[PDB]
């Protein structure tokens, strides 16, 4: 069995670290809800 415990408020933080790129990917979503990359 599972339970939940509080982790914080949902707020935008000013001066948060910015990182990561913004890739454009061709993906496929199957009926199980899993994403996979599309072969070239």
């Amino acid at each position: 069995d599972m339970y939940i415990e509080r982790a914080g408020d949902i707020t935008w933080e000013k001066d948060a670290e910015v990182t990561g790129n913004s890739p454009r990917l061709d993906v496929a979503l199957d009926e199980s809800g899993d994403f996979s990359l599309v072969e070239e």
Binding site: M2, I4, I10, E13
Partner: protein, 153 residues
């Protein structure tokens, strides 16, 4: 002993070992399906029972219908409110990429966090949850890209 109408909105760890993360808003708990697999959750005496769920969307709501409807504007940067297992919640700003499927385009964040972080909320500059983190792909270099998974209100 609470004022009538009081809730406790916020972000929560889904524990079992942290298996996921979820959003409490307007009395409904929102997380990803693969985190709880539609199982009931405990909230210290109170028990949360599933209300709506979809395996393909990988989303589930407890105590009521899905309440989150804000969407990424396709243009501005977002913030992942990452709640990793064993670490404090922390905001990460990023410009989303794009998942392109045969049925349209979805925003995606190129941020890499353990599996127990699934269900962490993604925010617009208003602080509105535009989706949940934790369902995506691992690309060739081993890094993880997550879709901005949003439900319907």
């Amino acid at each position: 002993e609470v004022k009538k109408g009081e809730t406790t909105d916020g972000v929560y760890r889904v524990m079992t070992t942290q298996v996921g993360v979820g959003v409490m808003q307007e009395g409904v708990f929102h997380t990803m399906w693969h985190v709880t697999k539609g199982a009931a959750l405990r909230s210290g005496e109170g028990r949360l029972d599933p209300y709506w769920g979809d395996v393909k969307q990988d989303l589930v709501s407890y105590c009521g219908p899905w309440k989150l409807d804000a969407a990424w504007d396709g243009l501005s940067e977002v913030q992942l409110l990452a709640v990793p297992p064993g670490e404090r919640a922390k905001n990460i700003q990023t410009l989303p990429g794009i998942f392109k499927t045969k049925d349209g385009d979805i925003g995606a964040v190129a941020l890499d966090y353990p599996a127990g972080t699934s269900g962490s909320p993604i925010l617009d500059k208003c602080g509105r949850v535009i989706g949940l983190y934790g369902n995506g792909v691992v690309i060739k270099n081993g890094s993880y890209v997550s879709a901005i998974t949003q439900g319907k209100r």
